[PDB]
From a paper:
Fatty acid synthase (FASN) catalyzes the de novo synthesis of palmitate, a 16-carbon chain fatty acid that is the primary precursor of lipid metabolism and an important intracellular signaling molecule. In contrast, Type I FAS found in eukaryotes and some actinobacteria are large complexes of multi-domain protomers that are composed of one or two repeating polypeptides that are each encoded by a single gene and organized in a symmetric or pseudo-symmetric assembly. In humans, the FASN gene encodes a 273 kDa polypeptide that comprises the catalytic domains necessary for palmitate synthesis, which further homodimerizes into a pseudo-symmetric complex. The contact point of the condensing and modifying regions is the neck region, a flexible linker composed of two short unstructured loops which allow for continuous swinging and swiveling motions of the two regions relative to each other, maximizing ACP accessibility to all catalytic centers. hFASN is a validated anti-cancer target and is over-expressed in solid tumors including those from breast, prostate, liver, and lung tissues.
For this effort, we selected Denifanstat, an orally bioactive molecule with antineoplastic activity. Denifanstat (TVB-2640) blocks consumption of NADPH by the KR domain in both protein preparations. We found that the drug binds the same pocket and interacts predominantly with catalytic residues from the KR domain and the nicotinamide of NADPH. However, the binding conformation of Denifanstat is different from triazolone and piperazine compounds, with the Denifanstat being more solvent exposed and interacting with residues from the dynamic loop predicted to be involved in ACP binding. To the best of our knowledge, this is the first cryoEM model of hFASN complexed with the first-in-class anti-neoplastic inhibitor that is undergoing clinical trials and can be used as a platform for rational design of other novel hFASN inhibitors. Finally, we solved the structure of this region bound to an anti-cancer drug, Denifanstat (i.e., TVB-2640), demonstrating the utility of our approach as a platform for structure guided design of future hFASN small molecule inhibitors.
Numbering used by the authors:
A (entry chain F): 858 to 1124, 1217 to 1244, 1251 to 1271, 1312 to 1316, 1325 to 1347, 1375 to 1393, 1400 to 1802, 1805 to 1866, ...
B (entry chain E): 858 to 1122, 1410 to 2074, 2077 to 2112
Write the structure that this text describes.
Amino acid sequence: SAAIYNIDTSSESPDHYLVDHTLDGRVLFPATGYLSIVWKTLARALGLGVEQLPVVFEDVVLHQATILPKTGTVSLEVRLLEASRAFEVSENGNLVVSGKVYQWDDPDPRLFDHPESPTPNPTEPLFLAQAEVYKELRLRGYDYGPHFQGILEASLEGDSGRLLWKDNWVSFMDTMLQMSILGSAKHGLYLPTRVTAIHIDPATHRQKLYTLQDKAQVADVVVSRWLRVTVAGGVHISGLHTESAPRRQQEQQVPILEKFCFTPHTEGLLDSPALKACLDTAVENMPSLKMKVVEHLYSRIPGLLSPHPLLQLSYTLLVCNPASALSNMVAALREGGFLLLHTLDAWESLFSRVSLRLVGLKKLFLCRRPTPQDSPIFLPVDDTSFRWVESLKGILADEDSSRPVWLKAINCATSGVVGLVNCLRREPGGNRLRCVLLSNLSSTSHVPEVDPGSAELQKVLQGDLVMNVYRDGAWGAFRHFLLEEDKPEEPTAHAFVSTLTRGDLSSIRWVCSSLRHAQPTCPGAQLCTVYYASLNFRDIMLATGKLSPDAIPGKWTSQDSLLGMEFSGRDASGKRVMGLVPAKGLATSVLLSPDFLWDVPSNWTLEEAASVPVVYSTAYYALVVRGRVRPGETLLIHSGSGGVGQAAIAIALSLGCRVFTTVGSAEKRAYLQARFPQLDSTSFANSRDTSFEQHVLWHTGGKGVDLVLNSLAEEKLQASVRCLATHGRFLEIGKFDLSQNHPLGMAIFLKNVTFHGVLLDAFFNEADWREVWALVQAGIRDGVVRPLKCTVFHGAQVEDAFRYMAQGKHIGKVVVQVLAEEPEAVLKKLMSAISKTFCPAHKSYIIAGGLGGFGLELAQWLIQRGVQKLVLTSRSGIRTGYQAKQVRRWRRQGVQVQVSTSNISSLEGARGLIAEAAQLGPVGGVFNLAVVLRDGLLENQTPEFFQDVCKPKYSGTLNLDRVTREACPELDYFVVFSSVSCGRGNAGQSNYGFANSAMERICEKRRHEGLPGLAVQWGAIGDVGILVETMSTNDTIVSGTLPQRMASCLEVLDLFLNQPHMVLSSFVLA
Amino acid sequence: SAAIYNIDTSSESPDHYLVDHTLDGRVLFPATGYLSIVWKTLARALGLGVEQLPVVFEDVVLHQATILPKTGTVSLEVRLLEASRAFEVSENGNLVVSGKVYQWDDPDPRLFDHPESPTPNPTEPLFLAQAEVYKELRLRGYDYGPHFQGILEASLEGDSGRLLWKDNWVSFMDTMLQMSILGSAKHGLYLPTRVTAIHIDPATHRQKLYTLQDKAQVADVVVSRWLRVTVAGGVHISGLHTESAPRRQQEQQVPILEKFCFTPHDSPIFLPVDDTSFRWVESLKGILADEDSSRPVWLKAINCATSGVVGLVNCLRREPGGNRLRCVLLSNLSSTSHVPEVDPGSAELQKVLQGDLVMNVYRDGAWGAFRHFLLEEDKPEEPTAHAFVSTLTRGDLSSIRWVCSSLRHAQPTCPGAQLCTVYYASLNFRDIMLATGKLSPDAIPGKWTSQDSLLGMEFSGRDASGKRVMGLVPAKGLATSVLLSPDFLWDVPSNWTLEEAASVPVVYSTAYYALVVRGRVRPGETLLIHSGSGGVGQAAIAIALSLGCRVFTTVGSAEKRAYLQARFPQLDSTSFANSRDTSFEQHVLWHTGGKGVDLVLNSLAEEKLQASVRCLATHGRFLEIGKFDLSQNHPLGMAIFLKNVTFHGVLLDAFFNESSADWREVWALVQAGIRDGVVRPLKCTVFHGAQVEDAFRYMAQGKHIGKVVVQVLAEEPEAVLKGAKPKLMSAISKTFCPAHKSYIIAGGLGGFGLELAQWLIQRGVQKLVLTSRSGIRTGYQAKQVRRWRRQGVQVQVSTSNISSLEGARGLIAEAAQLGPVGGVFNLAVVLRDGLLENQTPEFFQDVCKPKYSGTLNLDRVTREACPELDYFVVFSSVSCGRGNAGQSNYGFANSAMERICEKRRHEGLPGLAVQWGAIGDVGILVETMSDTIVSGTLPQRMASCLEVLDLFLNQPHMVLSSFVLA
């Protein structure tokens, strides 16, 4: 019969380890789980056990992924064809896995021998530990749980390592597959789809397992990328073919983005940031997380307070939108409560009569009832030595006393008192003990300071607001405002077309390109001004998500878009040219070698010239170079009304060749008849079904065609092969059958048939292209290369062009005109594009703390954004294997990344660091990610903790500020990574909040003077960091906030770097 | 899961009709039987009936043939993979049929529309009847019984017809396949092995059926070989592939071959049978009426020396009253005129009567009788300068011998063809596969007859001018002489030897083709050659090293490794891998840096071909010169073409069909390589032409390195020897005919007449004159005659009756108009059966007019005006030698024919009388009678009949017999 496996991933279920095989947030059945169940079925059929049956899997193809639900059961049916040696796995009648499985009759232990490494004896003392290996895997989208974490150790290149054996054949072989992708330079999720051959011999597997000092038996895994073979224990995976799996948008966390900006106390309104500011002020001035609010304000206040993670809201603070009513409201409100009244001298008099003190004015009236307090304690937190923390502990150590303690920062305007107070407010000492500050942050020296011991601070006590900051005359405090949802745009002459969300044509926008921040115009490349950029089928396959971006050959990062393979326009000299590019051709400008450039003749329009390069190069390479079309031959050209088909028709008819075309429309028949008069009514067939084969065979006298230009697939491809004549040439221009490894029956080759896999894409990564270029040029001179039909969409209608030519109704080529041709001469451009952060290759960028968790990922992101001169500052240098691997990759791929021990906490250290950066090139960016943690309750806090926690962040940022101001006139980025702890408050880390707030003040001062400045209030970071590596596993709720993923973190950083705001925040709600 | 189908061929079993699907004497399960079984399994799985389940079969592959035993049951297990749409038929765990089966979701009745014929049928009235269709099929080896005889009618071209419907799908689709293979130029037993797609829609099948006047449901069948499709009713077979299954050597037709040579040792009734009016038949009947006085019946033939009453006495003895009559003959068969006539009125007659011998015939002073002697089993060997190597029995290297070539009995002379004496002929892998039977003769392209031997693909020797040349031929290279076009000849260089040069033409042509013309190898390209120790591998190594290419070679032994290292010193230790394993792939991928190799010249198979494909680099070229994976249609993963990889199916044998400038490119490449020294001949192990069998078995095992060369003639020391005549060597005699001579077949439109005509065409006859009183009537005759005419033979269908002397003279003149009369075959026969009691002198006259008088006139006219006559063959019957019930006249005519032939041979003229037994598969016993015992003898099959006739035509005996005992 059929063996049925009810896959239950329940707690008491004997297959519960499968819940730990999470990929992109979905529990997927492992590719090796199918092998295990097929092995079990074969053992049952043969009467043996799995451990007693060596097994061989051949041509294993995984047709779909099985999603294991949280609750329920998935039934997988394994059917064996013993005579055919084949198997199949079905979920609900749908084919899941197919291939050949059979008993290994003569098992060879010599097969499971580790092949010699291509670069043996690396002499590398640093390796990738298990934690680092799975951190790197998680960064790529592999959320493997503890049961599938079997790589205890691996080399930095992923070519060798150690595999933990846990009496499991699914987990061990899945870790074997993990090792095969650990060393891959590809980015993103890669799932196994085809494996050429898997050999499992448990007999030699048992003898290859050796126990460690832990007493857990392990094996040694080796990945030979040259041989395409993975061996570990008694398993030999050969020919594994992983295919990119798109990362689902559901797993993409949506973060809350806010800007930290100073808000004066004294400044339609319901739907304005003033209401949010008042609500946040009330939340800040509160004993605990309980929010007792009594009231059309029910539709805004709960929504505005919802982003706050720890706020417990009880909506029925007093909000309303006369003397007796005010008295009743005051009586209802408790001591220290806030009354928020919205209405269109009399109001102030009524508030005074009701003993209400106004603390906010938005022109929304904010009133707070004074609370009886004794003489306050004045503690200056402006001491550089942090000697004030001892007095802070002394006053806050008396739990019995409720006397207010007013902190003051009258000096050192860059004082981080805000974050310190934010963290103290939720600490058990100081929740109601009034740990209130007062900061005089003068952004300009012209504005005079507020003298102490005067009426201004008396008004401060009168208001009794927890946060009181004097910023350029006005009195207020810093507060969080929701960031604008719109992506910032700038007028740029260099832009490109990108799909912001993969697979969505409506997401197509023009984005700032990397050809403006860096323009390294040198021989071998040319910054060509694109006038017309045509679309190809690959562009839609990319923009609709049907084709993975990495399937395009060439070194492409995970951020850049690859839309457009061809353009026409101008040159640096101004000559009218048309060029062929591997990608990025759908842009305002393209950097391209002159080898892939032609000269547009005088008669040709620039618009019509924009359809020739891709289509005619493809046709020439397929027909002349590869197909070797002799004159007078017979050709079957599929999709002859398309681009490549039309050029092949023109080329063949230039040689006087009999042509058979397949078109799916009578309109396309008419168009081809009109375009090429030499075609006969018998020359046209149907491209939407197989009957073209019967048409060709009948009209060729059963002989067939000498050439086939096949873009069709499946049964149409098989019929096209059947159309071949003796000595016939088959040119495969399509990719579906090739990508799916569909079986081509090897009996057509008995007709002296040559099968061509024609891909005009290796010309951009390997020379021989000059032959095709010369052929295209010669066809241009002879008139053979004729411009195609061009449907024109302007630059602003790129989405319209994409969704038009996706319908398939277009005839010829669809052209996106970027810049209109000027009729003034044939020898003699601003556009609002989304701001994307890009960096010149000639500038140096410093990441203090760049060897840490966020530091390494930010460095990699900067590399992908064009940074070629990088300086990473660490207090200890390279210690971990992960850091060594990342720095090694960056150095190998061409970047001048330099590790420096110089500490920014010292001014001389910062000067030396800036000098080291300037040695490579001008300092274009400074990133302060240096951090240490002395987290603990205030009673355990010591001044030395404040010194050593503020030196990495506060004094380091001050030194970076000074040195950049005095030696970096060309600096473009000054980014410090603060924390949401500073923004709102995290009990147990007060000095951390102080350092972060001081960095925020430094950045605000920098931005006020017109210098670059940016402070990012980061929430918990998920993939890497300090809290994740130490303790936090996966995504646990931390202080009401989910740990943000690195992909979202880098996207948010890209967004933040293109905003005029001084300080912005980012976190993900639980 | 597995649906069990116990196939029982017992009479009570529902599957008893399967006994009628006999092929080559074996009851085979039809391919359509597998189709119906899988269809039933799919219907059961979907809970439907077959008639309610339109079905599609795809990529049906038949891996083995199921033999249905006479006693017992064969169980076929069918397992369905619905998810993958695949099925599998297994018998005792062995895979039989695999493919894709699924329900036709959208049945299109427009699919079952008969395609238009490429040309209109001119002979619409002249079609092939059911009897003719299955007579032809049985001749090809298809012994279809009544249940599988569903082709009611068929056109001569075999592209259309009608199929009878018996509510049986297996029979209907089998007849569809039969109609598909009916119009096939290929001869032999062809069985389906692969079908691309089969669409069965019973819904439109019911509509397509129609009822004739016989109340029998029929369906029109159309076969389109241009579209490679066959449509009939609601069945659509596309891409049917049939491979010629060799006919089993366990042929029960082991004829008893005998000679007929003269063997010296109441009231008497004398009846003179010498009268030419046969008026004595009534007297013989009156004599046989009596009982007592009829004991001494002494019928004497005195006047005519070729009276032939021997058959009269033999057949009349079997009649009731023959032994009682004791019929005794006095035949004065004086072979020479100078011999004295034995007087029948003297003491000689008294002595003959006293002897009482059953048969007494006088022959030049000897009183004897005609007796049957067993024919010598030794094949006649003759000294000829034109002989070829052939396997007498396929698959047996022991049965390898030299047979007289077609050039000996037919010397051709025409521009564009050269007759070159062969000094050294080289064995090739295809030759070994042909001799061992692993390769069918039909796999080699060309127009090859059934008896044609295709051993030998390459040779070296001297042309007609005496120049030293080595050439390449499609086949027949293992001969003492080769007739080939000059475009396939290379001049042997002075420093080369004929033995040395006899290794280049195939090996280096193939290597140069595959590498340069197909592979387009460029200098410096990493290149992988499989089996580099063999010929083609060695040539590819030589070419690649001449181009300075890095070479990876796979060899099966360390000795071959050492030989390649010594021969090509440019190969390092890292250039060699293992060909008997997959490890060459790992070796190549490691030593190439994982990139691959730019070219792969692969002759390996199965996993060793997939590994080689995996060895390919980006822009790699795969040159597939092997055939196993090509012939088996093994799947090839198409993801390799994502590496810009070109896959070449390289077959050098395609150059012998067109011989255009495409071959001239390879010829120029080989000549240039010869003149630059790139083409260097391989090591040759030489076996003398006397012993070719040991060469075949030596190279079959595979220890040989380089080439195995058979030396036909030792190269004499000279440059251009004027003579160049092949040495006279003894070879098995084979009947061949000049192309310039005309051959007459009296009664050549009959069954045996048509078979002999086809055999003569296969033996080189180009001018045929078939005679028939009524001309062409049957569609089989028209099809055969038009096929011969289209082949190029001048076939003349004359109505000149050989009964009259004037008619024979006109027939001979008609033949001489085409060309000199090289041979006359007398097969004209009319039959007037019945016992002697119900017999008439007119019946004797009618029966003897075609045979007795026909041979009279043929002998006379050939003597007068046929100096170049080589054959005078008449077909007698065993009924003459022994006797048949109620066939006295037939025996008399046959014996007269035999006497005529004996006299002709005695006078030195050609003459042959064949006493045929029951003739099978065609003729009179096939139409009138029904593998049925006739007079204790089985009907001899026509393949055996033609083989025995070939044996007889090369014998010195006047009369021989052939029959098969039951």
